[PDB]
């Protein structure tokens, strides 16, 4: 049972720029996603200090990197705060509007795509390497949802009847045909060591 939504014009614009601009340093997408996971984990930890029951959905706070050549996907999994339906459909977009505006102006002023994180919109860097991104997420007091978008100005959201995750987010990157290097263990290990060696949570890189 799928609902389809239009990205706010600004977000659609950011995505086009990301997909269209010639920029070779694509590997920064992983750092942006791992960072978002780190932030989510930080929040659920902080919240658990005043309400321990919030960890009933899972006490483990970590990150998993799962590559799959068969499906040509790279999934970044975390046990963080998760996102609600309201987050996925309106709230995160509202916030992303200002970040986008600032980021695009900063670019014209000499900045580059690798700085997208300082504007709160790093998630969209996933499109530097993915033709389609599917996001499975579960927040403590909402249901598990599946958000998805191949850009083009729209995204869908549905209640996920798959396999329960308890609490957290899974960013599934359906890679572009010429970006399969991100499925190789050596390459992923290289990027993590280069841009995310100090994340304060365990990061497990699965092998195939």
Ligand X SMILES: CC(C)NCCCn1c(Sc2cc3c(cc2I)OCO3)nc2c(N)ncnc21
| Dist CA 180 CA 124 (whole Å) | 19
> What would the x/- binding string for ligand X be over residues 8 to 47, using CB under 6 A?
----------------------------xx-xx--x----
The length of the chain, given as a count of residues: 208
83 binding ligand X? (CB under 6 A) = yes
103 binding ligand X? (CB under 6 A) = no
75 binding ligand X? (CB under 6 A) = no
The least CB distance from residue 153 to ligand X, in Å, is 14
The least CB distance from residue 148 to ligand X, in Å, is 9
31: left (phi over 0), alpha (psi -120 to 50) or beta: alpha
30 vs 83, beta carbon nearer ligand X: 83
Judge residue 139's burial from the number of C-beta atoms within 10 Å of its C-beta, 0-12 exposed, 13-18 middle, 19 or more buried. Answer: buried
Backbone angles phi, psi at 204, to 5 degrees: -105, 120
According to DSSP, residue 91 is labeled I
Residues in contact with ligand X by CB under 6 A are 36-37, 39-40, 43, 78, 80-81, 83, 88, 92, 96, 121, 123, 135, 147, 169
């Amino acid at each position: 049972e799928v609902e389809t939504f239009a990205f706010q014009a600004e977000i659609a614009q950011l995505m086009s720029l990301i997909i269209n601009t010639f920029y070779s340093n694509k590997e920064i997408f992983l750092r942006e996603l791992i960072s978002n996971s780190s932030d989510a984990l930080d929040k659920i930890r902080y919240e658990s200090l005043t309400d321990p029951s919030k960890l009933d959905s899972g006490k483990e706070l970590h990150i998993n990197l799962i590559p799959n050549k068969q499906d040509r996907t790279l999934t970044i999994v975390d046990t963080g705060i998760g996102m609600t339906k309201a987050d996925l459909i309106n709230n995160l977009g509202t916030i992303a509007k200002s970040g986008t505006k600032a980021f695009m102006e900063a670019l014209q002023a000499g900045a580059d795509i690798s700085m997208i994180g300082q504007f709160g919109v790093g998630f969209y860097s996933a499109y530097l390497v993915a033709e389609k991104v599917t996001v499975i997420t579960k927040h403590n007091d909402d249901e598990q949802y599946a958000w998805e978008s191949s850009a083009g100005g729209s995204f869908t959201v549905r209640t996920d009847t798959g396999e329960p995750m308890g609490r957290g987010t899974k960013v599934i990157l359906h890679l572009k045909e010429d970006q399969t290097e991100y499925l190789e263990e050596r390459r992923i290990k290289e990027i993590v060591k280069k841009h995310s060696q100090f994340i304060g949570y365990p990061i497990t890189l699965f092998v195939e």
